Design a protein around this ligand. Structure first.
Ligand SMILES: [Mg+2]
Ligand SMILES: [Mg+2]
Ligand SMILES: [Mg+2]
Ligand SMILES: [Mg+2]
Ligand SMILES: [Mg+2]
Ligand SMILES: [Mg+2]
Ligand SMILES: [Mg+2]
Ligand SMILES: [Mg+2]
Ligand SMILES: [Mg+2]
Ligand SMILES: [Mg+2]
Ligand SMILES: [Mg+2]
Ligand SMILES: [Mg+2]
Ligand SMILES: [Mg+2]
Ligand SMILES: [Mg+2]
Ligand SMILES: [Mg+2]
Ligand SMILES: [Mg+2]
Ligand SMILES: [Mg+2]
Ligand SMILES: [Mg+2]
Ligand SMILES: [Mg+2]
Ligand SMILES: [Mg+2]
Ligand SMILES: [Mg+2]
Ligand SMILES: [Mg+2]
Ligand SMILES: [Mg+2]
Ligand SMILES: [Mg+2]
Ligand SMILES: [Mg+2]
Ligand SMILES: [Mg+2]
Ligand SMILES: [Mg+2]
Ligand SMILES: [Mg+2]
Ligand SMILES: [Mg+2]
Ligand SMILES: [Mg+2]
Ligand SMILES: [Mg+2]
Ligand SMILES: [Mg+2]
Ligand SMILES: [Mg+2]
Ligand SMILES: [Mg+2]
Ligand SMILES: [Mg+2]
Ligand SMILES: [Mg+2]
Ligand SMILES: [Mg+2]
Ligand SMILES: [Mg+2]
Ligand SMILES: [Mg+2]
Ligand SMILES: [Mg+2]
Ligand SMILES: [Mg+2]
Ligand SMILES: [Mg+2]
Ligand SMILES: [Mg+2]
Ligand SMILES: [Mg+2]
Ligand SMILES: [Mg+2]
Ligand SMILES: [Mg+2]
Ligand SMILES: [Mg+2]
Ligand SMILES: [Mg+2]
Ligand SMILES: [Mg+2]
Ligand SMILES: [Mg+2]
Ligand SMILES: [Mg+2]
Ligand SMILES: [Mg+2]
Ligand SMILES: [Mg+2]
Ligand SMILES: [Mg+2]
Ligand SMILES: [Mg+2]
Ligand SMILES: [Mg+2]
Ligand SMILES: [Mg+2]
Ligand SMILES: [Mg+2]
Ligand SMILES: [Mg+2]
Ligand SMILES: [Mg+2]
Ligand SMILES: [Mg+2]
Ligand SMILES: [Mg+2]
Ligand SMILES: [Mg+2]
Ligand SMILES: [Mg+2]
Ligand SMILES: [Mg+2]
Ligand SMILES: [Mg+2]
Ligand SMILES: [Mg+2]
Ligand SMILES: [Mg+2]
Lengths: 98, 101, 206, 151, 127, 115, 79
RNA sequence: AAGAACCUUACCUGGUCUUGACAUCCACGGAAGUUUUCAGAGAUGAGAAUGUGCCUUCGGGAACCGUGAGACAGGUGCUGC
RNA sequence: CCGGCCGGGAACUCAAAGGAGACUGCCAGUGAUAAACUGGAGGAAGGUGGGGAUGACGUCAAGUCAUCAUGGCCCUUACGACCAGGGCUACACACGUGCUACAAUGGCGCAUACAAAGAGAAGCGACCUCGCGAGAGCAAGCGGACCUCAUAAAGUGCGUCGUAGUCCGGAUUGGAGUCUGCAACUCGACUCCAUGAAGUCGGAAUCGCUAGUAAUCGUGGAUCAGAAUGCCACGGUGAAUAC
C-alpha cells in the first residue's frame, strides 16, 4: 500500500509538494486517495522581549507544522520507484512507510 | 557571559559523554533489587565517587550557544530568549512568525 | 524602544524566511547553530564583496547556501576559484555537502543592508554623517524607490552627548502589513564609539 | 458609560416555575457561578414557603417582594458646591431588583441552619412585614421623607 | 425521511437528527431525563419545540461531544432549530423573533500576556 | 466512654469520638473499629459496655497519650542534647523543616514583637 | 529522608576512618565531607567538620549515627 | 531568574595555577586514544600496560597531545550621564 | 461474541486547504440638496461583529556595560584561572504579590456525569503483578488526529455530621519512608502515621472587573535530573450592574 506522510512549516510550499508527489504517482502508475490533511501542530513560545526587568512585556511566537498524507492502496512497480530518488521540494520533510 | 564559564562548560559536555553515557551501568544495573544487594551494591556507590565530580549530566547548566547566558534558555532553539528574538524577527528560525490568536 | 522589527512582522505575509528548511525537534537546535556558524563566518569573510542577505536551505542532508550580493564578480573571483574555496570551508563547519549559488542585484542602492553598510563604511572614514546619510537618501530615490527612511543614532561627529537624526523622502508606512519594506541595521565602530544605522526602504505596495 | 446608551441582555425562564421574576432572584442569590446549587435552594425555599403560607410560589414570592420594595431611594448630588441628600424616584427595573438584594443580604445574616430555611424565613417575615429586609426599606423611606426638602 | 441540523454552542458540537414519529428524545444512547439531570435547564433543548409543537410528532436522535452541560444543551437547542427546516420559512419567521437560530458566538477569551486571567489585572502599589 | 487515658465524648460518631484520644486520628480510628468489628455510623451513647471493652484492648496495641507524649518529648530532648542543627533550631524557637525565616514563621517563632 | 541503597559516606572519609580506627585514637581529622553519614565505627573519634570558614571538632557519640556530619557544624552565625 | 542541593555562581573560606581552562602562530617530543594502580578533600602529582593510522619533500606531513618562548589570551571590574 | 468491534460507508462531527459572507450594501425617518445618525429588513454575524498582533513625533540625560556588541578608564605571581565545602534559603522587625483558610451554597464518604488545549525518543511509559501510599518491578505501544502522561474538577445522586475553634481550618512538630540524583545536614519534592497552631470575614485605607467578562473548579506547557502557591496557555458552571 505505502502510506506516504509529509510535513512542513510553510502552508503554501507543502501544497505543490503534495500536488507533485501525487501527480508523479497517479499519472505514471495509477491509484491515489488524495491529500489527507491531519491536524496542524502549533508549538508556541513566550519569550521576554527586554534584556532586563519588564516582565509584563513579552513577544509570542509559533511554528505551524503542517502535516499531509497521500495513501495509495496498491504496491505498483511504476509508483513505488518514482517515490524514491525523485522527491526534491526543499523545506518539506517526507517519510514513506510501507 | 565569561569565556571561562563558556570554556569550563565544554569540559562538562565532553567529559559527560565519555563516562556516564556508557558507565550508567555502575549506578543503574548494579544498584538494584536482586542478588547483588550485599557487597556488590556497596562497591558500586563506593566506586561511583572514584569518577570525577563532573561527568554527571545534572552538572551541565545548559546555556545559550551564541552568547553563553545561563538563564532564559529554550531547548527547541538552543538559544537565549534575547538571541532567539533577534534571530526570529530577521529570518533565521524557519517558520517562526509572530503568533496571535 | 517601541517599534516592531519590520522584517519580522511580515515574515508570513510579504517577506520570506531566509533560512528555509524543515527539521524535527531533536536536530532543530543544532541545525540552527550551524546555520548561524556559516552566516557569521561568510559575512565577515565576504565584507568587500558586498552581501545583502544569505538564504540557506537543507533538502535531505545537503546545505544549499545562496548569497544575494551587489558585486557578483568579487565573490566568484577568477574562473570561480573563490566559490570552491568557500565551498570547502563552509561544508566543514556546517554539515557534509555544499552548493553555493550567487544571485546578482543590479539595483544595489535599494537593498537596506547595502545602504546601511555604505553609510557605516563612510562614517568610519571621518565623513560628515549628514553628507553620508542625505546622499544615500537622494541616490536611491532617483533610481526607483518610494520611501527610504534612514536613521543614524549615536555619538556622530565626535559629540559629547549622543543624538538620533533621520531624513526620509516619501511613503514609508511601517504599519501597513501588505507593504514590502526592506529594513536593515549596521553598527559603525568609530574612534568615539558605536553609531547605529537603521534603514527602511519602501519599494512596492504589495 | 459616558454616552454609550446600549440595552441589556435577555435572561431565561426557570424550568419548574417558568417565569422571570424569580429567575433574577436565583442570579442575585448565586455565588461562584454555581447556578445548580443556587437554583436548588430557591425551589426548596419557595416549596417550604408555599406549604406554610398556603399560596402558590409566584404570588407568594410577590406578596413578600412588594413589602420590601423601595418607592424612593437617596442619592447625593452637588450642584453649585455643597453636598446634601437628594431623594429620587427609583426606576421600575431596578425597583424589584433592589428589593431582591435586600432579601438575600438579610439571609446571609440570621444564621438559622440552611440557606433554603433562611430565605423561607426571610420571605415569611416579609409577608408579615417584620424581618430585616423590611427594616432596610423602612430606613430608606425615613431618609427620603425626612430629606424631602431637597428636590 | 430524516432531516438534520448541526449546532455548536461554545466548543461543544451537537449533531441532531430528526424524524416524524414518537415524542421521545434519544441522546448518546441515553434518555434525555437521565443524561441532563439537575444542573440548570433540561428544557432548553425543548424550548425550540414549543412555538413549533412536538408532543408526539417528531422523534429526535441526537449525538453530542465537547464542552460541558450548558454548552451541549445550548448546542442541541441550535441544532434542533437548524434541523427544523422541513417547513423551510414558515417556521423560521416565528422562531427567529425569540432568538434561537442565532449561533451566539461568544467563546472564552484567551489569557492576555501580563494580565492574570483575560481581564483581571494583578493589583496596584503606589507607595 | 472512658477508654485509654481520657476519651469521654457523647453525641458523636465512634470514628470521630476516638480522634479525641491523643495518638489516634482519622485513619487509625477506622482501623480500631474495623478490628473490633463495630460500625462507624453508630455513637457511644448507642453502644453497650460489652462492646467498649474490646476498644480498650485495641487502642492498647498502639502507643497513645502519656506513652506517646514522652516518646515525642524524648526525641526532641535528644536532638537538643546532641547539639545538632535541628536541636539548635528547637531551643532557639525557629522552624525546623528548612523553612523560610524572614517574612513568615509566625507559628514557630510566635506573635509579633517590638524593635 | 533519602537513600535506601546503603547509607552514604565518601570513599576518602571511609578509608581515613578505617585507617584511623585500626591504628588508634590520635587527633581531629580534617574532613570537608558534611554530606557523609556517621557509621558505628566512627564512635570515639573527634573528627573536624568544615563549617565553611573553619573546622569544628565533633566528638562522635552513640546517638550520632543516622545523622549526617554537617548537622554538627553550624554554618551561619547569629547574635 | 523559563524553576540556586553540587553545577548555575558572579559572593565568601581555604587550597592552588601563572602564555594559563578557552586562540592562531615560531618549534621540541610524541599517533590519537584506551585499560588500570598509588598519595590527596579535590584540584593535582606519580606511574604501569597496550595501541603505534590516512602521504612520503621522507631534515617532513593534516589533526591531536604535552613542553619553553613571546605577540598575548582573560575580566559578570567601573562608567546606561 | 453485540465495544466503530465489523465489512464497509462519504451524509454528518472533525481535520485541513482554497472560496462565499457584513459593505450603513437595503429600508424608512432626523439632518445642510452633505457627512452622518436613529430605528428597521434580512442575516450565523450589524455598524471598527469578539479577541489578538500592530505602539507616530517624541518624553522620563527611564532600565540594561550582568545577554551580546561597545568607546574610554582600570586589573596582569591578579579584580585572571581550576577545586572541596560554605553562601545566595541567614531573622528583634517592615512592606509587596500570592495561596489556603475562617465553613452548612459547606466538610467527609460511596457512587457516577460531561471538556479543551497541549506534550513525548539517554522519550512519554501502558497492561499486568508487588505495594496502606509516594513508588517498585516486568515491560505493550507512539517521533503520534494511531501509543502514553490522562479517571478532568466543579457538577449531579444518596448517605452522615447540626453551628462547634467544630468531622471547619491543616499550620507545626515527632516518627517511618519514596523517587530523582555521585551526593537530600545546612537546603529538595512527595508519601504514610500521629500531631491539630493562628483564624469565627479583618483598623485607617484600598484593588480589579462592563459578558462567556467577574467569580469559582479542574488541566496543560515552557525552564526542568529533581524542585511552582509563580509565569504562560486551556477549557467547565456562570452571575450582578451600567438611572
Ligand atoms: Mg505591547
Ligand atoms: Mg567577554
Ligand atoms: Mg530503587
Ligand atoms: Mg541543572
Ligand atoms: Mg530606542
Ligand atoms: Mg536609544
Ligand atoms: Mg512593541
Ligand atoms: Mg491587549
Ligand atoms: Mg501575571
Ligand atoms: Mg477562564
Ligand atoms: Mg497601599
Ligand atoms: Mg508596578
Ligand atoms: Mg502614595
Ligand atoms: Mg491528617
Ligand atoms: Mg514546601
Ligand atoms: Mg531558611
Ligand atoms: Mg558573632
Ligand atoms: Mg563551588
Ligand atoms: Mg581565600
Ligand atoms: Mg565584584
Ligand atoms: Mg539612559
Ligand atoms: Mg541606551
Ligand atoms: Mg539614570
Ligand atoms: Mg471544522
Ligand atoms: Mg450612505
Ligand atoms: Mg432633507
Ligand atoms: Mg441626495
Ligand atoms: Mg438593527
Ligand atoms: Mg433585526
Ligand atoms: Mg458608531
Ligand atoms: Mg468589518
Ligand atoms: Mg473588534
Ligand atoms: Mg492600525
Ligand atoms: Mg531610576
Ligand atoms: Mg541604575
Ligand atoms: Mg558588557
Ligand atoms: Mg553592573
Ligand atoms: Mg572594551
Ligand atoms: Mg586617555
Ligand atoms: Mg593604563
Ligand atoms: Mg534571592
Ligand atoms: Mg525551599
Ligand atoms: Mg502585614
Ligand atoms: Mg475546601
Ligand atoms: Mg488532543
Ligand atoms: Mg490506560
Ligand atoms: Mg498506572
Ligand atoms: Mg487496573
Ligand atoms: Mg512502572
Ligand atoms: Mg501532538
Ligand atoms: Mg485507537
Ligand atoms: Mg500531569
Ligand atoms: Mg458532591
Ligand atoms: Mg464530589
Ligand atoms: Mg460557625
Ligand atoms: Mg483562637
Ligand atoms: Mg479536614
Ligand atoms: Mg481540633
Ligand atoms: Mg466569605
Ligand atoms: Mg464586607
Ligand atoms: Mg471597613
Ligand atoms: Mg473606612
Ligand atoms: Mg479602585
Ligand atoms: Mg471597557
Ligand atoms: Mg487556577
Ligand atoms: Mg495540578
Ligand atoms: Mg512537562
Ligand atoms: Mg504551575
Amino acid at each position: 500500500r505505502i502510506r506516504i506522510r509529509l510535513k512542513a512549516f510553510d502552508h503554501r510550499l507543502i501544497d505543490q509538494a503534495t500536488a507533485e508527489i501525487v501527480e508523479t504517482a497517479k499519472r505514471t502508475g495509477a491509484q491515489v486517495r488524495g491529500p489527507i490533511p491531519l491536524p496542524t501542530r502549533k508549538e508556541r513560545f513566550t519569550v521576554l522581549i527586554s534584556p532586563h526587568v519588564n516582565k509584563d512585556a513579552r513577544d509570542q511566537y509559533e511554528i505551524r507544522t503542517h502535516l499531509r498524507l497521500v495513501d495509495i492502496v496498491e504496491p505498483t512497480e511504476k509508483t513505488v520507484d518514482a517515490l524514491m530518488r525523485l522527491d526534491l521540494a526543499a523545506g518539506v520533510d517526507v517519510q514513506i512507510s510501507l | 557571559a565569561k569565556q571561562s564559564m563558556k570554556a569550563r562548560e565544554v569540559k562538562r559536555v565532553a567529559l559527560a559523554d565519555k563516562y556516564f553515557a556508557k558507565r550508567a551501568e555502575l549506578k543503574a544495573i548494579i544498584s538494584d533489587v536482586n542478588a547483588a544487594s550485599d557487597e556488590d551494591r556497596w562497591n558500586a556507590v563506593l566506586k561511583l565517587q572514584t569518577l570525577p565530580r563532573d561527568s554527571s549530566p545534572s552538572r551541565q547548566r545548559n546555556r545559550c550557544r551564541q552568547t553563553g547566558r545561563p538563564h532564559g534558555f529554550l531547548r527547541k532553539f538552543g538559544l537565549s530568549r534575547i538571541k532567539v528574538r533577534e534571530a526570529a524577527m530577521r529570518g533565521e528560525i524557519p517558520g517562526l512568525k509572530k503568533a496571535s490568536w | 524602544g517601541q517599534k516592531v522589527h519590520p522584517n519580522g512582522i511580515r515574515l508570513g505575509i510579504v517577506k520570506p524566511w531566509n533560512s528555509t528548511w524543515f527539521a524535527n525537534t531533536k536536530e532543530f537546535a543544532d541545525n540552527l547553530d550551524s546555520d548561524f556558524k556559516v552566516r557569521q563566518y561568510l559575512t565577515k569573510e565576504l565584507a568587500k564583496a558586498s552581501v545583502s542577505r544569505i538564504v540557506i536551505e537543507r533538502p535531505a542532508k545537503s546545505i544549499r547556501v545562496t548569497i544575494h550580493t551587489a558585486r557578483p564578480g568579487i565573490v566568484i573571483g577568477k574562473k570561480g576559484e573563490d566559490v570552491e574555496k568557500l565551498r570547502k570551508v563552509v561544508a566543514d563547519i556546517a554539515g557534509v555537502p555544499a552548493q553555493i549559488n550567487i544571485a546578482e542585484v543590479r539595483k544595489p542602492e535599494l537593498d537596506a543592508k547595502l545602504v546601511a553598510d555604505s553609510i557605516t563604511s563612510q562614517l568610519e572614514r571621518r565623513v560628515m554623517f549628514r553628507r553620508a546619510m542625505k546622499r544615500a537618501v537622494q541616490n536611491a530615490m532617483r533610481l526607483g524607490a518610494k520611501g527610504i527612511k534612514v536613521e543614524v543614532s549615536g555619538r556622530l561627529g565626535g559629540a559629547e552627548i549622543a543624538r538620533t537624526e533621520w531624513y526620509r523622502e516619501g511613503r514609508v508606512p511601517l504599519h501597513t502589513l501588505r507593504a514590502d519594506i526592506d529594513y536593515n541595521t549596521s553598527e559603525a565602530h568609530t574612534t568615539y564609539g558605536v553609531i547605529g544605522v537603521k534603514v527602511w526602504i519602501f519599494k512596492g505596495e504589495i | 458609560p459616558r454616552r454609550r446608551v446600549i440595552g441589556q441582555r435577555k435572561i431565561l425562564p426557570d424550568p419548574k416555575f417558568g417565569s422571570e421574576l424569580l429567575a433574577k432572584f436565583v442570579n442575585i442569590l448565586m455565588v461562584d457561578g454555581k447556578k445548580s446549587t443556587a437554583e436548588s435552594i430557591v425551589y426548596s425555599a419557595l416549596e417550604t414557603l408555599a406549604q406554610r403560607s398556603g399560596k402558590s410560589e409566584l404570588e407568594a414570592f410577590e406578596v413578600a417582594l412588594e413589602n420590601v420594595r423601595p418607592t424612593v431611594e437617596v442619592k447625593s448630588r452637588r450642584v453649585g458646591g455643597s453636598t446634601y441628600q437628594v431623594p429620587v424616584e427609583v426606576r421600575p427595573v431596578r425597583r424589584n431588583a433592589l428589593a431582591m438584594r435586600w432579601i438575600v443580604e438579610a439571609a446571609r445574616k440570621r444564621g438559622d441552619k440552611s440557606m433554603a430555611l433562611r430565605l423561607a424565613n426571610e420571605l415569611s417575615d416579609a409577608a408579615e412585614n417584620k424581618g430585616t429586609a423590611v427594616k432596610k426599606r423602612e430606613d430608606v423611606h425615613r431618609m427620603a421623607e425626612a430629606n424631602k426638602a431637597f428636590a | 425521511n430524516q432531516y438534520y441540523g448541526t449546532g455548536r454552542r461554545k466548543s461543544s458540537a451537537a449533531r441532531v437528527f430528526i424524524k416524524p414519529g414518537n415524542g421521545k428524545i434519544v441522546i448518546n444512547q441515553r434518555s434525555l431525563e437521565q443524561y441532563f439531570g439537575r444542573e440548570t435547564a433540561r428544557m432548553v433543548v425543548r424550548q425550540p419545540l414549543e412555538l413549533v409543537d412536538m408532543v408526539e410528532k417528531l422523534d429526535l436522535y441526537i449525538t453530542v461531544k465537547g464542552g460541558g452541560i450548558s454548552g451541549q444543551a445550548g448546542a442541541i437547542r441550535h441544532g434542533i432549530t437548524r434541523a427544523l427546516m422541513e417547513y423551510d420559512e414558515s417556521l423560521r419567521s416565528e422562531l427567529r423573533k425569540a432568538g434561537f437560530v442565532t449561533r451566539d458566538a461568544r467563546q472564552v477569551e484567551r489569557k492576555k500576556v501580563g494580565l492574570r486571567k483575560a481581564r483581571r489585572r494583578p493589583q496596584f502599589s503606589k507607595r | 466512654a472512658r477508654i485509654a487515658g481520657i476519651n469521654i465524648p457523647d453525641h458523636k460518631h465512634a470514628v470521630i469520638a476516638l480522634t479525641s484520644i491523643y495518638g489516634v486520628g482519622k485513619t487509625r480510628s477506622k482501623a480500631i473499629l474495623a478490628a473490633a468489628g463495630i460500625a462507624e455510623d453508630v455513637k457511644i451513647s448507642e453502644l453497650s459496655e460489652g462492646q467498649i471493652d474490646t476498644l480498650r484492648d485495641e487502642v492498647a496495641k498502639f502507643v497513645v497519650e502519656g506513652d506517646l507524649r514522652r516518646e515525642i518529648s524524648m526525641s526532641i530532648k535528644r536532638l537538643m542534647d546532641l547539639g545538632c542543627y535541628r536541636g539548635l533550631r528547637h531551643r532557639r524557637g525557629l522552624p525546623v523543616r528548612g523553612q523560610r525565616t524572614k517574612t513568615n514563621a509566625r507559628t514557630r517563632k510566635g506573635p509579633r514583637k517590638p524593635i | 529522608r533519602s537513600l535506601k541503597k546503603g547509607p552514604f559516606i565518601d570513599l576518602h572519609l571511609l578509608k581515613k576512618v578505617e585507617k584511623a580506627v585500626e591504628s588508634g585514637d590520635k587527633k581531629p581529622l580534617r574532613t570537608w565531607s558534611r554530606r557523609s553519614t556517621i557509621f558505628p565505627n566512627m564512635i570515639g573519634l573527634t573528627i573536624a567538620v568544615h563549617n565553611g570558614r573553619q573546622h569544628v571538632p565533633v566528638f562522635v557519640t552513640d546517638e550520632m549515627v543516622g545523622h549526617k556530619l554537617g548537622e554538627f557544624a553550624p554554618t551561619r552565625t547569629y547574635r
